[PDB]
């Protein structure tokens, strides 16, 4: 009711970069709760509520990567009486079938006048004589009342919620994610972010002979991903001229291979511009619509940038499960052996460099946020 | 008791390559059951048992990638009487608390004299008057007795077992997997195989100042992986001289970066020799012992071969879970920001090409099998 105490996932200078990234991301997520103050130490993040609805704050906190668990806590002055009080207040904030309880005491303030042995019956007694049909269970308690005793101030909590886990978005760096309208790529973007890497999305569209409705899918997908980070930058690359030239200059059996090669070349040029160190795709091995190893081998020739492939060894079912969980599935669902020698030999016949450079120069950038 | 009918995972020329790969892998797995005959059509694989212990065959069948499910079946001639018989025999082969049953009839042979409507009470009646304390349930049956009626011969089955899933090892091609003694790399090798890609393992060891016990770990890990494919080819590359030269020629802050770059260069040279189209690693993002994106970005400079990274966005817990499931965990457990400009500038100072070529020439190859 007074505080939310967030416990970090897992991590010197590495912790600083972790904490301050988490701070900024949490701050941004809760900015529509302007009364809150946040102190983030190297071991714990303290969210001072100052009247702000703890439930409302909780519902937004659970979507932030980098948080293992968090607790709704009471911060009370550190003598027995103020401790007794805070325990009760914390206890009463627990909705649901509440019939039994337990008290647990961590004593970090070693010079506290009373012993844990003695504190137990005291706090229990105070909750007992201030409730109605409620007893204690040491073995099967409904509500665990945990008392952390520190000097000056002490925390009481009963309400432990799971966080999203993973790593604060931004701590690991930045990659470009190749986003398309299928089920896969948004999932891959999501998994990248969960490991603390922020993503900028890159989408190739060919405005005449691809529809606006298909472009809206990608925008909608990028919009949905805003739930998991501060903002999603979406680069829309006009691909139509490159697509046309490939049809004219390249033998048909290789047109798709070269187009994907051209996609990767352009994406690398964007990655450099944006100081991104890798490129994410939703490629996976061995599905009907998934490319062969031969295809992958031939397309990857054009870049020695890491190509992060989160779904590389995942099956359709686990991919769909996640897409459903994160809520990109129903948007995605809207219904709209190559060799290196030959790929090179065909590309030798026309200089795609001006096309590549213009496509980079012509990209449009949207910046999406969760619109509260 | 007479047959095992395997149902395929999921997949023209693509099915042929799938079926015959599965056939060869199953054949190899069951070669110590020499009486068995295997017919594999494009829709089903039939294993004629010919007296061979079906349980023993089942226990080895469940570890073969490419099998969704399989059934212990009876193949009986296709008139009512031989059908009644086979149903009972199939039913009686079911160990466990058997008290109720049900009959289900798929009628693929359209010109079969009797209708499903009539077949139901007949087969049920025959099992009823030939068992003791057993009735039928249409809603909550212990044993489902499924009758597939075809011309000439018909199948009865009650015993549906799950298979390993994934894709027949070999169907997708071949990659080199970089294998080390940690928890990760064997898991990555395993996940690669489950998507139907066979792996050849590559391990760098530096015989004087790495132990034989550490090399035995990798051998043990490769041995354990033989459970999931026909054989594991393990390449042991002597790395000591390259390691020494790096210590002498390279500034210390970059020695590890260059060593890994040298590893990747050698591995690519081996991949080519072995007609492998990619390289698998157990790299993941954002664990304490995992490399940074900067590190990954700088090491990947030296190869434009696909680098398959199955665990790239997995956490420690899911990695450990799998390593435990596949039984590599307890072997692994045995206790034994770089920039491209600087990496290149330092490597410019000494020609590592002769070292790279000799290491490739000096690799030793072991071939491991599951030793029944
Ligand atoms: N039009 C596109 N724009 C951006 N990325 C794409 C596009 N098409 C495909 N991709 C990326 O390439 C991956 C594999 O392509 P595919 O095998 O054609 O589904 C997808 O998961 C996307 O990450
Ligand atoms: N000595 C080695 N031999 C072969 N592969 C290795 C070796 N050391 C590391 N690797 C590979 O590189 C990956 C990441 O290395 P690391 O970040 O050092 O654990 C491991 O998962 C292995 O696939």
UniProtKB/Swiss-Prot annotation, chains A, B:
Signal peptide: none annotated. SUPFAM superfamilies: Adenine nucleotide alpha hydrolases-like (SSF52402), THUMP domain-like (SSF143437). It is found in: Cytoplasm. Gene3D superfamilies: 3.30.2130.30, HUPs. ATP binds at residues 178-179, 203-204, 260, 282, 291. Keywords: ATP-binding, Cytoplasm, Nucleotide-binding, RNA-binding, Thiamine biosynthesis, Transferase, tRNA-binding. Residues 55-160 form the THUMP domain. One of its GO terms (biological process) is thiamine biosynthetic process. Pathway: Cofactor biosynthesis; thiamine diphosphate biosynthesis. Its EC number is 2.8.1.4. Its main location: cytoplasm. PROSITE patterns: THUMP (PS51165). It catalyses: [ThiI sulfur-carrier protein]-S-sulfanyl-L-cysteine + a uridine in tRNA + 2 reduced [2Fe-2S]-[ferredoxin] + ATP + H(+) = [ThiI sulfur-carrier protein]-L-cysteine + a 4-thiouridine in tRNA + 2 oxidized [2Fe-2S]-[ferredoxin] + AMP + diphosphate; [ThiS sulfur-carrier protein]-C-terminal Gly-Gly-AMP + S-sulfanyl-L-cysteinyl-[cysteine desulfurase] + AH2 = [ThiS sulfur-carrier protein]-C-terminal-Gly-aminoethanethioate + L-cysteinyl-[cysteine desulfurase] + A + AMP + 2 H(+). One of its GO terms (cellular component) is cytosol. GO terms for molecular function: ATP binding; CCA tRNA nucleotidyltransferase activity; tRNA binding; tRNA-uracil-4 sulfurtransferase activity. Catalyzes the ATP-dependent transfer of a sulfur to tRNA to produce 4-thiouridine in position 8 of tRNAs, which functions as a near-UV photosensor. Also catalyzes the transfer of sulfur to the sulfur carrier protein ThiS, forming ThiS-thiocarboxylate. This is a step in the synthesis of thiazole, in the thiamine biosynthesis pathway. The sulfur is donated as persulfide by IscS. Belongs to the ThiI family. This is Probable tRNA sulfurtransferase. The gene is thiI.
């Amino acid at each position: 009711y007074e505080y939310i105490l967030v416990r970090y996932g897992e991590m010197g200078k590495n912790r600083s970069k972790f904490v301050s990234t988490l701070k900024d991301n949490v701050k941004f997520k809760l900015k529509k709760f302007p009364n809150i103050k946040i102190d983030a130490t190297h071991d714990r993040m303290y969210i001072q509520l100052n009247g702000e609805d703890h439930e409302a704050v909780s519902e937004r906190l659970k979507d932030v990567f980098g948080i293992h668990k968090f607790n709704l806590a009471m911060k009370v002055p550190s003598e027995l009486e103020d401790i007794k009080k805070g325990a009760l207040a914390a206890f009463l904030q627990v909705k649901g079938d509440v019939k039994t309880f337990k008290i647990t005491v961590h004593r970090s303030y070693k010079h506290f006048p009373m012993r844990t042995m003695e504190l137990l019956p005291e706090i229990g007694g105070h909750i007992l004589e201030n409730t109605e049909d409620i007893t204690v269970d040491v073995h099967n308690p409904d509500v665990n009342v945990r008392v952390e005793i520190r000097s000056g101030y002490s925390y009481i909590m009963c309400d432990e919620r799971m966080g999203a886990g993973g790593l604060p978005v931004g701590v690991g760096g930045k990659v470009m994610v190749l986003l398309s309208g299928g089920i896969d790529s948004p999932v891959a973007a999501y998994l990248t972010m969960k490991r603390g890497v922020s993503v900028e999305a890159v989408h190739f569209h060919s405005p005449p002979f691809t529809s606006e409705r298909a472009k809206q899918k990608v925008i909608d997908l990028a919009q949905e991903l805003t739930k998991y980070c501060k903002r999603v930058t979406l680069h829309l690359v006009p691909f139509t001229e490159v697509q046309k030239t490939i049809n004219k200059e390249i033998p048909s059996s290789y047109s798709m291979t070269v187009m994907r090669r051209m996609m990767m070349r352009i994406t690398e040029r964007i990655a450099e511009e944006r100081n991104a160190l890798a490129i994410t795709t939703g490629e996976s091995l061995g599905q009907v619509a998934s490319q062969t190893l031969d295809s992958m081998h031939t397309i990857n020739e054009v870049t020695n940038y890491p190509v992060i492939r989160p779904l590389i060894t995942m099956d359709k079912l686990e991919i769909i499960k996640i897409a459903e969980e994160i809520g990109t599935y129903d948007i995605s669902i809207r219904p709209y052996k190559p060799k290196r020698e030959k790929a090179n030999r065909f590309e030798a016949k026309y200089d795609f460099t001006p096309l590549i450079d213009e496509a980079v120069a012509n990209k449009e950038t949207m910046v999406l946020q969760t619109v509260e």
